[PDB]
RNA sequence: AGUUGGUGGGGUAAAGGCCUACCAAGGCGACGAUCCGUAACUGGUCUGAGAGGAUGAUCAGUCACACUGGAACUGAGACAC
RNA sequence: AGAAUAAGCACCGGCUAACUUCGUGCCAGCAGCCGCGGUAAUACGAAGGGUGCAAGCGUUAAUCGGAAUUACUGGGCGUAAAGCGCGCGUAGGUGGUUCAGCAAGUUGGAUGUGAAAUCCCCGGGCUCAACCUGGGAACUGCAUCCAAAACUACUGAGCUA
C-alpha cells in the first residue's frame, strides 16, 4: 500500500518459509531493479517482467540444501524513516558475507560496489 | 611501596615456584609448598572462575613485585599499544630495570635486583638510574656502577644465573659485568605456565 | 581430550504426600576445545550423580561450529525463549568477554576472542540454548558462496 | 514507540529522589540530639537499637542510628550524621559517625576500628 | 597595538614560551590572534630551542606589530 | 552571489510590507526524522504587489523597521 | 496599543518605534507565545562499546556584576571594582 | 655513618578473594541485598590464621554504567503495566504506476570557517612517570560553489491495480 518495495521482500520471505518455487507481484522500476541486484548476486535464480499494461514481476527461487539461500531479508529505508548513508557509513551485513542493497546515483547496486564506486545513497534492504 | 614479608606463603598460596628465593635450594626443601599457608592448609575446595583470574593476576604481580596501580596503568598502556592486549602486557613489565638486571643475573632474585638498582649501583647507557620501574629499550646497555663492580652479590648471582636458564634476548659480559638489551622477548621466550588471557578478562569486570 | 565445564547446579523440589523430595539439576557443556561443542542436562537425587548424568547427555548432543579461526566470523544475534544473545568477533588478544552462563560455551567451543552480551532473561539454561542456536547457524564464507553459486569473490 | 510519536514527545527519564534529603548533597551534616531512645525492629529481628533524634544545621529533624556497643550521648549533644539507612528500623535513614564531636568511639574495639572511631592501642 | 610577545606555557621552574601575536591589552597567557613560533630556554637534546616561522613574523611586523625586548633579541638570534 | 530565500506569503494586511513563511526541514538530532519547520519573516515591499498565497523571494538586507530586515526580490508565482 | 507597520521630523559614531507627531489595526502564539521555578553560556569534564546520559571546578573565549537603586561627566574607548 | 629513621587500613556466609576457637545467647549487636544472632554462630565481640590494598585504607555524598529499567541504536500492550467504548474528521505523518524536467533532500569533491588548550596518533625533554612540548589527526557542524539524477520532495503530462 504505502511501501511497495517492502512488499517485494516480504513476498519473497514468506515464500521461502513455505518452500514455494515462484512468486508473482506487480512490477516497478525499483522492484525490477532490486531483482537485478539479487539475481546478479545469486540469491534469486532469475526474474522476468511480463510486459503488459499491468506488468507482473516473477521470481523463481533458489534452495541449496532445502534451506532457502536467503536466510534473512530485512527492509531498512522504510517510508516512515528513510535512511541515507555515506560511502564510509554503508552497512556491512554479517561482516561482508551478506549484501546491503543501496540505491546510489549510479543506479541500484550493492554496498560492495558502492564503496568501490565511492558513492552513497539510500540503504534499501539487507540480505543474507 | 613494596611487599616485605615471608616469601613461601606467596608461592604456597598459589602452588607455583615463585622466584622470590635464590636457586641455591629447591623450594620443597625450604617450605611446605604442597599446602596453602595458614592454619587451614590441608583443606580442599574448588576455586571460583573469578578467583582463578585473580590468583593468575597476583602471580604476575608477585613474580615481578608490582602493585596493580602500575599494573592497571601497565594494562592501560598495553590496552593502549597496538596488537594483542595479551603479549603487550608481559613485555611492559619485562622491560623494568630491576627485572632486566635480574635477567642479566646481577641479582639472584628480583628483590636483590630492585635494591641493587635502587641503590644507584646500575647505570644504563652511562647514566645512573636508581628506579626499579624504568623502561629499557632495544639496544640499551645496562651496566653496574664502577664502585659497585666488586660487589660479591652480583659476583655470586652471576654464577647463580648460569643454573637458571640462559635467557636469549639479552647477553652479559662477565668481565665488564655489563649487558645489552637486544629486543623485547615474545611469548615463546617467557614461561608458558602463565595465562595472560586471564589478565585481560579479569580487568573487564 | 574433552574439556568439560560446569555452568550451574540447581536444587529443584517436588511435593508429595508428606514432606518434599529434593532433586539436583546440573547443566554442563562439553567440547573438544577447537571445533566441537555440546551441552546437556541431567537430574539426579545427588550432586555427584547429577553432574555425571549431564556429562553423557552433553557429549551425545554435539555439533560442528565453523569458526573463522581462534575467533568467530560475523556479528550475529540469537534468541531462544525471551533470552536474546549478541556475539561479535574480536581481534587477537582480548579474552572471552561474555556472561558466565555463556562464557563456558564459547571457551569450550574453541572461541578465545569474542565480544558477547545477554539481552532479556539471563536463565543459564536458556542462554546456553540461544548461543548454541547462534553457533549452530554459523556459516563460513565458502558455504555462503556455495549457496549463491559464486566464488569467495562475493567478499 | 513509533518514531513519529517519539519526535513530538521524547523519551522521559525519571530522576530518583535521594534517600538522604536532610543531608542536602553533602557527605555529612552537624546536628544536636533532641531525644535519645531505643526502638524495636520489624518482624524477624528483636533488639533494642539506640536511635537519637537530631536537629540538623539546616533545620531538618531526623533520627539516625547509633552504631557500636554503648554510647555516651544524651540530650543537647553535638553529633555528625552520615548517610545509609537501617533496614529493620522503620524511619531511620542516617548513621551517626562515632569518633567526631561529642559521640566518642566505642570502648575496647579492636577490629574495624576506623568505621567506629576507635583509637589504636 | 598588536604586539609579538612570549606566552609562558611550560611548567614550574621549567619555562616554555610561545611566540604569540596578540593585542597588547590581552593577558600574557590569555587571548591572542595567532601563534607564530616558540622558544625553549631549557632545551636539552632533540628539543628545538627556537622556531620562528619567519614568513608570518614579517607579515605582522609589516602590519605594525611591536615585538617585546625578548622577542626582538630572539628574532635577531633566529636570523643570525 | 547573494543568498535569497524562497517561501509562501501568509499576511499582507500591513502597509508596504508582507509576511512570508519559510519552509525548513531539520532532522531530529536523535530520531533522525525530517520535521517541517516554520520561519515567518517580515519582508519589506516598497510598493505593494504581493497578495496572500504567492511564492516570493527575499534577501537579508537593511534593517528598515523593528522586525523588518528582509526585502523582496520578485514574485516567482502569483496566486491567481 | 509604541504595541505592529507607514509618512514627516528629531536622535545615534551607525540602521532601527531609538524618540516623537499623524494615519492604519496591526504584531506574536500548540512549530508553545505569555507566565512560574531554576540557571551564567561555550571549548570542554565525568561516565559509556557506541548512541547517549550527567555536568559547566582548575585553564581558555564571551557575558553580567562591583555595598543596594539610579544618573550622567570626562575620555578614542565607561555609564567606570 | 649506621639497617640503622619509616606499616597501616578494610574484609573472610553467598554475591566476593579469604576460617577456626573462645565469650554472648533474638540480649549484646551486624547489616549494600539475601539475611545472622532465641546455649556447639566460618554472618555478633575478641584471639589466632588468611585475604585484598598499602602511605594509604574504608564510610558517606553525587554522576554515569551495569539498566535492553524511556529501548534512535535497542523494549513492550490477549492473560504479567499498557488498544481510547466506538465512528467521522482538522493540523500533521505517510502515500499505487509510467515518461520528462528541476535539484531542496540525497551522494562525491573543492573552498571558507569550525579560536587556543584538552581527547587521540607518532616523536622530543625532565634519571622514568605524573608533567611539558613539536607535528598530525579530529572538531561527526555550518555556509558557498561545482558535478550526478537511483529514491524522496516539487513541476508538467499520462495509466488503472
From Swiss-Prot, chain A:
Keywords: Ribonucleoprotein, Ribosomal protein, RNA-binding, rRNA-binding. One of its GO terms (molecular function) is rRNA binding. One of its GO terms (cellular component) is cytosolic small ribosomal subunit. It comes from the Bacteria. One of its GO terms (biological process) is translation. Belongs to the universal ribosomal protein uS8 family. One of the primary rRNA binding proteins, it binds directly to 16S rRNA central domain where it helps coordinate assembly of the platform of the 30S subunit. NCBIfam families: PRK00136.1. HAMAP family: Ribosomal_uS8_B (MF_01302_B). Part of the 30S ribosomal subunit. Contacts proteins S5 and S12. This is Small ribosomal subunit protein uS8.
Curated annotation (Swiss-Prot), chain B:
InterPro entries: Ribosomal_uS4, Ribosomal_uS4_bac-type, Ribosomal_uS4_CS, Ribosomal_uS4_N, S4_RNA-bd, S4_RNA-bd_sf. GO terms for molecular function: rRNA binding; structural constituent of ribosome. One of its GO terms (cellular component) is small ribosomal subunit. One of its GO terms (biological process) is ribosomal small subunit biogenesis. Residues 95-155 form the S4 RNA-binding domain. Keywords: Ribonucleoprotein, Ribosomal protein, RNA-binding, rRNA-binding. PANTHER family: 30S 40S RIBOSOMAL PROTEIN, SMALL RIBOSOMAL SUBUNIT PROTEIN US4M. One of the primary rRNA binding proteins, it binds directly to 16S rRNA where it nucleates assembly of the body of the 30S subunit. With S5 and S12 plays an important role in translational accuracy. Belongs to the universal ribosomal protein uS4 family. Part of the 30S ribosomal subunit. Contacts protein S5. The interaction surface between S4 and S5 is involved in control of translational fidelity. NCBIfam families: PRK05327.1, rpsD_bact. This is Small ribosomal subunit protein uS4. It comes from Pseudomonas aeruginosa (strain ATCC 15692 / DSM 22644 / CIP 104116 / JCM 14847 / LMG 12228 / 1C / PRS 101 / PAO1). The gene is rpsD.
Swiss-Prot record, chain C:
Signal peptide: none annotated. Gene3D superfamilies: 3.30.160.20, 3.30.230.10. One of its GO terms (molecular function) is rRNA binding. Keywords: Acetylation, Ribonucleoprotein, Ribosomal protein, RNA-binding, rRNA-binding. GO terms for biological process: translation. Part of the 30S ribosomal subunit. Contacts proteins S4 and S8. This is Small ribosomal subunit protein uS5. The keyword Ribosomal protein applies. It comes from Pseudomonas aeruginosa (strain ATCC 15692 / DSM 22644 / CIP 104116 / JCM 14847 / LMG 12228 / 1C / PRS 101 / PAO1). The N-terminal domain interacts with the head of the 30S subunit; the C-terminal domain interacts with the body and contacts protein S4. The interaction surface between S4 and S5 is involved in control of translational fidelity. InterPro entries: Ribosomal_Su5_D2-typ_SF, Ribosomal_uS5, Ribosomal_uS5_bac-type, Ribosomal_uS5_C, Ribosomal_uS5_N, Ribosomal_uS5_N_CS, Ribsml_uS5_D2-typ_fold_subgr. With S4 and S12 plays an important role in translational accuracy. Belongs to the universal ribosomal protein uS5 family. Residues 2-65 form the S5 DRBM domain. Pfam families: Ribosomal_S5, Ribosomal_S5_C. GO terms for cellular component: cytosolic small ribosomal subunit.
Curated annotation (Swiss-Prot), chain E:
PANTHER family: 30S RIBOSOMAL PROTEIN S16, SMALL RIBOSOMAL SUBUNIT PROTEIN BS16M. Belongs to the bacterial ribosomal protein bS16 family. This is Small ribosomal subunit protein bS16. Coiled coil: none annotated. The keyword Repressor does not apply. It comes from Pseudomonas aeruginosa (strain ATCC 15692 / DSM 22644 / CIP 104116 / JCM 14847 / LMG 12228 / 1C / PRS 101 / PAO1). GO terms for molecular function: structural constituent of ribosome. GO terms for biological process: translation. GO terms for cellular component: cytoplasm; small ribosomal subunit. Gene3D superfamilies: 3.30.1320.10. HAMAP family: Ribosomal_bS16 (MF_00385). InterPro entries: Ribosomal_bS16, Ribosomal_bS16_dom_sf.
Amino acid at each position: 500500500m504505502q511501501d511497495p518495495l517492502a512488499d517485494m521482500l516480504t513476498r519473497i520471505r514468506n515464500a521461502q518459509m513455505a518452500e514455494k518455487t515462484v512468486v508473482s507481484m506487480p512490477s516497478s522500476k525499483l522492484k525490477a531493479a532490486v531483482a537485478k541486484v539479487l539475481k546478479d548476486e545469486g540469491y534469486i535464480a532469475d526474474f522476468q517482467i511480463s510486459s503488459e499494461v499491468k506488468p507482473q514481476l516473477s521470481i523463481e527461487l533458489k534452495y541449496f540444501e532445502g534451506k532457502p539461500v536467503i536466510e534473512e531479508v530485512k527492509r531498512i529505508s522504510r517510508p516512515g524513516l528513510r535512511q541515507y548513508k555515506s560511502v564510509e557509513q554503508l552497512p556491512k551485513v554479517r561482516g561482508g558475507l551478506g549484501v546491503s542493497i543501496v540505491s546510489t546515483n549510479k543506479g541500484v547496486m550493492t554496498d560492495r560496489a558502492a564503496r568501490a564506486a565511492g558513492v552513497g545513497g539510500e540503504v534499501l534492504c539487507t540480505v543474507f | 611501596a613494596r611487599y616485605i614479608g615471608p616469601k613461601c606463603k606467596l608461592s604456597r598460596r598459589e602452588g607455583t615456584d615463585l622466584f622470590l628465593k635464590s636457586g641455591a635450594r629447591a623450594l620443597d626443601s625450604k617450605c611446605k609448598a604442597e599446602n596453602v599457608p595458614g592454619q587451614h592448609g590441608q583443606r580442599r575446595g574448588r576455586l571460583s572462575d573469578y578467583g582463578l583470574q585473580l590468583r593468575e593476576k597476583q602471580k604476575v604481580r608477585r613474580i615481578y613485585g608490582v602493585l596493580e596501580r602500575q599494573f592497571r596503568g601497565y594494562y592501560q598502556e598495553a590496552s593502549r599499544r597496538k596488537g594483542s592486549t595479551g603479549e603487550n602486557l608481559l613485555q611492559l613489565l619485562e622491560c623494568r630495570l630491576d627485572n632486566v638486571v635480574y635477567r642479566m643475573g646481577f641479582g639472584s632474585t628480583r628483590s636483590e635486583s630492585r635494591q641493587l638498582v635502587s641503590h644507584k649501583a646500575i647505570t644504563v647507557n652511562g647514566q645512573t638510574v636508581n628506579i626499579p620501574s624504568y623502561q629499557v629499550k632495544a639496544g640499551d646497555v645496562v651496566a653496574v656502577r664502577e664502585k659497585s663492580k666488586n660487589q660479591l652479590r652480583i659476583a655470586q648471582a652471576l654464577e647463580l644465573c648460569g643454573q637458571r636458564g640462559r635467557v636469549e634476548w639479552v647477553e652479559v659480559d662477565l668481565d665488564k659485568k655489563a649487558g645489552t638489551f637486544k629486543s623485547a622477548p615474545a611469548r615463546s621466550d617467557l614461561s608458558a605456565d602463565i595465562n595472560e588471557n586471564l589478565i585481560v578478562e579479569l580487568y573487564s569486570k | 581430550g574433552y574439556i568439560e565445564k560446569l555452568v550451574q547446579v540447581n536444587r529443584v523440589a517436588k511435593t508429595v504426600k508428606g514432606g518434599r523430595i529434593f532433586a539436583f539439576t546440573a547443566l554442563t557443556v562439553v567440547g573438544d576445545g577447537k571445533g566441537r561443542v555440546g551441552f546437556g542436562r541431567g537430574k539426579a537425587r545427588e550432586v555427584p550423580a547429577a553432574i555425571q548424568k549431564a556429562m553423557e547427555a552433553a557429549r551425545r548432543n554435539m555439533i560442528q561450529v565453523d569458526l573463522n579461526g581462534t575467533t568467530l566470523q560475523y556479528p550475529t544475534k540469537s534468541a531462544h525463549g525471551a533470552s536474546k544473545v549478541y556475539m561479535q568477533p574480536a581481534s587477537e588478544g582480548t579474552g572471552i568477554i561474555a556472561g558466565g552462563a555463556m562464557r563456558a560455551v564459547l571457551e569450550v567451543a574453541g572461541v578465545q576472542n569474542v565480544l558477547a552480551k545477554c539481552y532479556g532473561s539471563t536463565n543459564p539454561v536458556n542462554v546456553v540454548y540461544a548461543t548454541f542456536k547462534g553457533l549452530k547457524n554459523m556459516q563460513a564464507p565458502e558455504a555462503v558462496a556455495a549457496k549463491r553459486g559464486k566464488s569467495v569473490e562475493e567478499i | 514507540a513509533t518514531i513519529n510519536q517519539l519526535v513530538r514527545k521524547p523519551r522521559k527519564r525519571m530522576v530518583d529522589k535521594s534517600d538522604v534529603p536532610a543531608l542536602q548533597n553533602c557527605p555529612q551534616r552537624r546536628g544536636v540530639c533532641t531525644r535519645v531512645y531505643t526502638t524495636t525492629p520489624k518482624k524477624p529481628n528483636s533488639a533494642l537499637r539506640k536511635v537519637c533524634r537530631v536537629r540538623l544545621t539546616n533545620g531538618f529533624e531526623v533520627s539516625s542510628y547509633i552504631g557500636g556497643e554503648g554510647h555516651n550521648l544524651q540530650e543537647h549533644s553535638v553529633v555528625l550524621i552520615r548517610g545509609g539507612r537501617v533496614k529493620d528500623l522503620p524511619g531511620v535513614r542516617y548513621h551517626t559517625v562515632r569518633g567526631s564531636l561529642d559521640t566518642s568511639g566505642v570502648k575496647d574495639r579492636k577490629q574495624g576500628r576506623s568505621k567506629y572511631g576507635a583509637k589504636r592501642p | 597595538m598588536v604586539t609579538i610577545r612570549l606566552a609562558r606555557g611550560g611548567s614550574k621552574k621549567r619555562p616554555f614560551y610561545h611566540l604569540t601575536v596578540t593585542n597588547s591589552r590581552n593577558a600574557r597567557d590569555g587571548r591572542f590572534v595567532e601563534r607564530i613560533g616558540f622558544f625553549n630556554p631549557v632545551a636539552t637534546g632533540g628539543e628545538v630551542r627556537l622556531s620562528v616561522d619567519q614568513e608570518r613574523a614579517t607579515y605582522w611586523l609589516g602590519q605594525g606589530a611591536q615585538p617585546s625586548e625578548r622577542v626582538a633579541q630572539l628574532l635577531k638570534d633566529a636570523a643570525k | 552571489t547573494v543568498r535569497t530565500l524562497t517561501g509562501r506569503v501568509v499576511s499582507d494586511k500591513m502597509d508596504k510590507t508582507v509576511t512570508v513563511l519559510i519552509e525548513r526541514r531539520v532532522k531530529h538530532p536523535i530520531y533522525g526524522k525530517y520535521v517541517k519547520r516554520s520561519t515567518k519573516l517580515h519582508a519589506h515591499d516598497e510598493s505593494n504587489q504581493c497578495r496572500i498565497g504567492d511564492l516570493v523571494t527575499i534577501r537579508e538586507t537593511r534593517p528598515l523597521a523593528k522586525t523588518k530586515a528582509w526585502t523582496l526580490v520578485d514574485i516567482v508565482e502569483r496566486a491567481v
